[PDB]
Amino acid sequence: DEICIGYLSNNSTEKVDTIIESNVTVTSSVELVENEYTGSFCSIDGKAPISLGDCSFAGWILGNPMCDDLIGKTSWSYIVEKPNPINGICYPGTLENEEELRLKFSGVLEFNKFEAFTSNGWGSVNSGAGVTAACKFGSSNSFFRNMVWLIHQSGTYPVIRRTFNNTKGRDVLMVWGVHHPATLKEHQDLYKKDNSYVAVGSESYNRRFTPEISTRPKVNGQAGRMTFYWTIVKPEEAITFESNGAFLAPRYAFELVSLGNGKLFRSDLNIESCSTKCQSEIGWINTNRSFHSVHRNTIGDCPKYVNVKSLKLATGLRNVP
Amino acid sequence: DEICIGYLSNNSTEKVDTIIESNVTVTSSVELVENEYTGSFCSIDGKAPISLGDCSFAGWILGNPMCDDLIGKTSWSYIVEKPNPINGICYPGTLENEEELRLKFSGVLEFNKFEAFTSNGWGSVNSGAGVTAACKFGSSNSFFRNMVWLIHQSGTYPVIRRTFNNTKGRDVLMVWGVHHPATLKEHQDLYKKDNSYVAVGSESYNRRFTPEISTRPKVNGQAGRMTFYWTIVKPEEAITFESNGAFLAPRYAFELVSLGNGKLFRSDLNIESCSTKCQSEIGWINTNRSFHSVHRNTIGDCPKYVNVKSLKLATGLRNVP
Amino acid sequence: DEICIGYLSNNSTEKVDTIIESNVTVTSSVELVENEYTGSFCSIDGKAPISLGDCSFAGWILGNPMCDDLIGKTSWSYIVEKPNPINGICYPGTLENEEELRLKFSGVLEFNKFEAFTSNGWGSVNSGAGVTAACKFGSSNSFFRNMVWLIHQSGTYPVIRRTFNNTKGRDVLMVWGVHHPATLKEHQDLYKKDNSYVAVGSESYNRRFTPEISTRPKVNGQAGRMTFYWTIVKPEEAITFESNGAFLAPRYAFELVSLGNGKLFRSDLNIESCSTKCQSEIGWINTNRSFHSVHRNTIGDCPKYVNVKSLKLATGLRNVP
Amino acid sequence: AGFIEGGWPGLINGWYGFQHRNEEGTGIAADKESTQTAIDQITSKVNNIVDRMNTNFESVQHEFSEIEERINQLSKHVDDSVIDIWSYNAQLLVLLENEKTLDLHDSNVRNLHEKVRRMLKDNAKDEGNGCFTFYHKCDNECIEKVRNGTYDHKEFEEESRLNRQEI
Amino acid sequence: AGFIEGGWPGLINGWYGFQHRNEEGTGIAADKESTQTAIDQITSKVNNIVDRMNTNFESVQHEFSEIEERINQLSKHVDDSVIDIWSYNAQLLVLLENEKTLDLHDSNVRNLHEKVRRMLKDNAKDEGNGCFTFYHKCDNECIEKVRNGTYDHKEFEEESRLNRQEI
Amino acid sequence: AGFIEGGWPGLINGWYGFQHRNEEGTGIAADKESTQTAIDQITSKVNNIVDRMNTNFESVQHEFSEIEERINQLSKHVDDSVIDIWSYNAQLLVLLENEKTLDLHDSNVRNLHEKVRRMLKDNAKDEGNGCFTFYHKCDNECIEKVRNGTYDHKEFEEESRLNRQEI
Numbered sequence A, B, C: 001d002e003i004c005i006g007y008l009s010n011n012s013t014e015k016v017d018t019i020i021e022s023n024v025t026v027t028s029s030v031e032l033v034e035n036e037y038t039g040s041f042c043s044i045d046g047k048a049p050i051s052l053g054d055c056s057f058a059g060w061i062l063g064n065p066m067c068d069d070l071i072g073k074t075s076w077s078y079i080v081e082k083p084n085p086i087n088g089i090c091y092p093g094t095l096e097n098e099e100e101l102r103l104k105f106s107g108v109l110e111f112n113k114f115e116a117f118t119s120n121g122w123g124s125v126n127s128g129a130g131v132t133a134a135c136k137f138g139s140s141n142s143f144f145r146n147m148v149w150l151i152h153q154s155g156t157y158p159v160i161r162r163t164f165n166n167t168k169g170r171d172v173l174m175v176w177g178v179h180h181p182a183t184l185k186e187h188q189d190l191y192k193k194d195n196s197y198v199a200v201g202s203e204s205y206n207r208r209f210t211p212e213i214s215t216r217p218k219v220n221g222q223a224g225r226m227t228f229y230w231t232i233v234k235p236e237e238a239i240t241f242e243s244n245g246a247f248l249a250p251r252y253a254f255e256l257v258s259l260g261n262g263k264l265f266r267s268d269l270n271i272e273s274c275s276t277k278c279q280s281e282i283g284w285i286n287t288n289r290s291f292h293s294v295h296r297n298t299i300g301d302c303p304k305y306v307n308v309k310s311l312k313l314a315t316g317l318r319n320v321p
Numbered sequence D, E, F: 001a002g003f004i005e006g007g008w009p010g011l012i013n014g015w016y017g018f019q020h021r022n023e024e025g026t027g028i029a030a031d032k033e034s035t036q037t038a039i040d041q042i043t044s045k046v047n048n049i050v051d052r053m054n055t056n057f058e059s060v061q062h063e064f065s066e067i068e069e070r071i072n073q074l075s076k077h078v079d080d081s082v083i084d085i086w087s088y089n090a091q092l093l094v095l096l097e098n099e100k101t102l103d104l105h106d107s108n109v110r111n112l113h114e115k116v117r118r119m120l121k122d123n124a125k126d127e128g129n130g131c132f133t134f135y136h137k138c139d140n141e142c143i144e145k146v147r148n149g150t151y152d153h154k155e156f157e158e159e160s161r162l163n164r165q166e167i
């Protein structure tokens, strides 16, 4: 009469590694890493993201006139830009510190666009022409909606000066620009004088800007350039714009309403109406696992990204009949 | 007749963890991490730190006139600034590259302040008025002590020029400024001409600055601004200041005497007369242990900071009656 | 009659460490870390590096006239500069973003230097005088070969403007400068007018620059300065230079032909005719081992640099007679 | 058939157990207590690796201009080498803990084998293949007492000494 | 009462030792040599974890302007993720070395038990509970020879074989 | 002269083996199979540490101006602390794997000792010192069968029981 002591042997075909032995079959093992993903943008806890449609970050912030589908997209879990948008800074130029502003907007989840300066309220100066073939609306000549391109009234551009008193109790993002005409004549015809300034000042900000007149190679048919600036007017700060020309005057500004952990993805993928605990640059991840190797650029409650495509962790015994 | 082999059992109530078991009682265990700290600034090897009292870094470097408690605080183990000091750049402005100069002073342990240019030696120009309600001494009008605000003598401000030959055989920190008046008239009344320059040249330095005239919102009752510059005059360099106005002329400069590992803490904690091997932003740490979790921002001979508040390391046996 | 079970005992004197025991003699152990290196610059895969001879990076890029040994050194595995090259920016000055350009050249393995603008083709202006004792060729007065220092012809300096149409299908590195004269007179005698501009513009670049006149100390006998700038003209981009003075006009430019993993070592050491899998700042490393502690600054197929001078890894048994 | 000659397809509800042959027949039956302990331990091991010892790190990549290439390459080098570090840490921890899991199962079965040898004392011959020939009749009442660890060696001490003496 | 059934409150000057009962009475005494070795080993383990394997890292935080937010967030991300890494390394090393410390004590006591079994050879019955019934009178002079490892099994070989034969 | 008393200068082509003395003389002979397994395992351990678990890191150091001292200090701090991290990782892994290598060799020799005890069963006295006095003549044909694991204990079972009974 007899009794033996033993362990489990198994149908299991699953292998794991140690430092001294590879491809060791065991009675059971878990895969720790997740690699399947879907390949659209979902909402994070039911909060939808926004598409910039066919606009650059810059085109959206400056109000490229073909970016009107975007008006009233004012809150988001995150933002999707396409990698080569068609509607940028249409009048050729640059937005100073565009990258620092891009980072700000990684931290912004809701803004509210308002009129900080009436288009009409700048004095003896033409608010009315200020349109160009570079910045078309339909087939018709327009300009960035968030600023107004002031020119002479009746053969004179006076010294114009207005102040914005930030009474919103929150950070206001303000944008404006300076015109860099191609020739002295373009300067004369628009600002009825030879050389102008833009002077911007708050309790914390202080800059003079001047046109730089020179012929550059044409972009959207323009030899001239514009440089667009932004700053944050903090609550209770007043900010004064003085100018006698070359001024892309502020009109619309953005009250920074909700801060929080956002992102800007660059991708061609489509926003769908689904939810995900976790969203990556190349698709959403739906997993109970705590590691993944889909893509490092992730938002939501996510597994730790790792280089390794598989971690087979032994639970069971060595398995030998 | 018999003999058994055995191990220790214990009063011990102390628990430790492993990968396969939590809260395992053991006969003895050491705590590796240190969490008690005191909450003042002590000296590091008997070298006291300094308080900036009620001045910003900027106020201290430029000599805000209410920062006289600071004269003869010329060496330190480290520096303590309050998070919102009351006495900054009193005449509203900026110190260019204030952050890079802050880093320099993380590396500076002793300076020596000296008169590089006599206030009275600039020529036919008033060294004597150059005071404003912005920069009060007591209840009386003053100005930054390390520069002098030169104005016209008898209705004329000539082109002034002086050179500093750095013969100290060590780096000299020099500061000066440019006045950005609020109106042409403020420019006229002070520099009896319409437009000025400040020209600073050395073997390595080369800048011409011009006033930028415009009304900014008032700060300390001033619509004007000043931009304060600094540079390091290296040993054997000569640096020439040329100006016909808007010039906050250098007076006092700083010989950078000792370099070494310093810090600048921002905190409201008080400097006491004690020694510590180790000083953190929120207090001093007195420990024989090699890890701590008090605060990461540390100076002196210090334990490794870690996120983890406790590491219970088993020394003894499992402990089972 | 008997049979025992046993293990190896040994000659071996070799020790290793564990967490519980130091200097444990074992029957065999490998040293994982490599510490010997030779101390010259070899080729990586039979591709030789270049010496900049007696020029700074900057002198080489701008064409210091004493750096003609360097013409036809157009491809390399990496670049060796000496710690104190004799021929730099001879006319005292700076290359803006020299360090960003140094990083670019860590990525560049072959360029091709070509004439983008004929010295003679600028309009009514003297291409011919434009030389100085600062920038000697032999014992005779010269200037940087890659730019030409334009001055008045027949008592006048007109507004000049030329465009480079990049039709190479590859990135062209273009260099130019601005003259900072010492006095208005030096400005007048060279640019027969009182004040000048340099205007540089492409589909993506845009700048005005101006001389800054001031009395500096002399360097290489010159009270004037020059600031040298660079940009990358992308294929199909046009770049226009416009100026009426203080212009160091582009002449030669560099087609960036091959990109890949390069380096720029600063060292005394000599380029020899040998190959190495692995080249460090202080010499070449020839090892089968997978860790080294020679120097972190490495190029080629290299072992992991580590702090630790020795890792003794046990293979054999404890070894006890 | 014991544990030295391998595992048992037919161990149903556990990782370790006993195979017996007596007069009433044959049976395989899992050991509830040594199995659950191993499961608590391996559940601790998984839960430590995937959470608690799984310190979280999310990539922060910003945008840079064409003359911010130094800061661009630095921000990307930080992200790359810190992923490389968490990725080594995960693969190593799995490799080191796989070796320890395999040694724990081996070591758990050999602990049962010796907890049973100490209960059985002089009443069974250790056949060396991880089995035990008893020196007495061990009916299903006797076997279940070996399995649930209530086997008092006095109940069968004399019967055993008498059968063994005679060998 | 041996080591299988648990530890001894009453082991005074040690971690491991011997409980004896003879004709002159009863005693507990620590094992000087196996205790010191364990202490040298654990002292090495602590000293390696708190210094030498405690590679130093001090946080560098500088100040940045409102338009240096990219470099500010990068410098803080480097500091955060590198503290995270040294913090994992410390907690992991403690967790893995706690398991090894517990297994070292277990393994040290079972090595004494076997160094004593090999000295005692055929002169004592291994009771299995970590004890030894001798087959001869073991007076305090005999016990102290077992404790200090000078017990020659020939001194008691015949007396033992004679008492054992008769069982 | 067994493995408890130490290793054998004179084990020629192996890490573990057998020393015998019979009537035809004395010999040392390495165990081909247990030696090669240990070698495959240690070869795996080295190859894992120097490649595959040796995740690559190259230093990225750029140049900076005198007013880029913040960015200079940060780029150098990243490089320093990441080297420090890969350097800890290598030294720790070597220290932990050195302990494991030494314990593997110790544990491999004790497994041969027990694979032989289980083959030999009741035919040899375990001398305790890692040797075996047989209870029968074991000629070179018998020894070689113990070494190559073909030793059937039935062939010598009666001879052994008869010599042992008589002791």
Ligand SMILES: *[C@@H]1O[C@H](CO)[C@@H](O[C@@H]2O[C@H](CO)[C@@H](O)[C@H](O)[C@H]2NC(C)=O)[C@H](O)[C@H]1NC(C)=O
Pocket (backbone or CB within 6 Å): A022, A023
């Ligand atoms: C584990 O086994 C697998 C499959 O048997 C190995 O993967 C193969 O590696 C060989 C080269 O040595 C290749 O020829 C095959 O392409 C691989 N097969 C498959 C299906 O992927 C794997 O390398 C083994 N792992 C280790 C560490 O040895």
Ligand SMILES: *[C@@H]1O[C@H](CO)[C@@H](O[C@@H]2O[C@H](CO)[C@@H](O)[C@H](O)[C@H]2NC(C)=O)[C@H](O)[C@H]1NC(C)=O
Pocket (backbone or CB within 6 Å): B022, B023
């Ligand atoms: C180890 O012991 C402590 C003490 O009992 C545990 O901490 C408690 O955790 C529970 C839930 O798990 C909390 O709600 C209690 O409030 C905690 N109690 C105290 C006194 O702090 C701890 O979680 C245990 N560790 C493990 C890994 O199981």
Ligand SMILES: *[C@@H]1O[C@H](CO)[C@@H](O[C@@H]2O[C@H](CO)[C@@H](O)[C@H](O)[C@H]2NC(C)=O)[C@H](O)[C@H]1NC(C)=O
Pocket (backbone or CB within 6 Å): C017, C022, C023
């Ligand atoms: C292993 O042994 C050596 C040699 O005895 C140790 O290194 C020496 O340490 C002494 C003082 O203990 C120094 O003054 C010597 O200059 C060192 N000599 C050499 C040749 O290295 C080594 O540190 C020992 N290992 C440990 C962990 O203690």
